[PDB]
Write a structure and sequence with these properties.
With 137 residues, the protein is mainly beta. It is built from 2 helices and 10 strands. The structure holds retinal (RET). It is found in: Cytoplasm; Endoplasmic reticulum; Nucleus.
């Protein structure tokens, strides 16, 4: 359905704990938590092809993928990874990531459109799950 839209964050939970698992030191975690509270997500969806632009005050990144086809992006802490997205249901998809180089926590993400019109993003590193909730602009 309708992932397409301009989304603004209303809630961000456990993001600091996620970055801590990923090795980010305390001062940068605090500043990253602050940046995340200004997160905006623009999505264009055509069938199972997605164009996604995630931005904060000073940074913007574009994620392009097709469900079921491997692509390359970065982990939350900025390491290059190979990613693969699959549907889990009508309006939820799940992305598994694999580091291109080296070792690290096992990371993934999910994107879900709820019946109440919220977009829920989850980001995971090992046992720690960050949940972010967005509404349409
Ligand atoms: C479908 C939506 C997706 C896959 C959103 C991904 C979002 C990110 C990779 C956000 C990353 C951020 C940081 C790594 C620190 C700066 C603040 C964020 C939350 C924009």
């Amino acid at each position: 359905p309708n992932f397409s839209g301009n989304w603004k964050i209303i809630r961000s939970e456990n993001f600091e704990e996620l970055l801590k698992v990923l090795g980010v030191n305390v001062m940068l975690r605090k500043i990253a938590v602050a940046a995340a509270s200004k997160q905006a997500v623009e999505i264009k969806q055509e069938g199972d092809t997605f164009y996604i632009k995630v931005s904060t005050t000073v940074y913007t990144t574009e994620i392009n993928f097709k469900v079921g086809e491997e692509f390359e992006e970065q982990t939350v802490d900025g390491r290059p990874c190979k990613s693969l997205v699959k549907w889990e249901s009508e309006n939820k998809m799940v992305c598994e990531q694999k580091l291109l180089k080296g070792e690290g926590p096992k990371t993934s993400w999910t994107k879900e459109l709820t019946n109440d019109g919220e977009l829920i993003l989850t980001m995971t590193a090992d046992d720690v799950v960050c949940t972010q909730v967005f509404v349409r602009e």
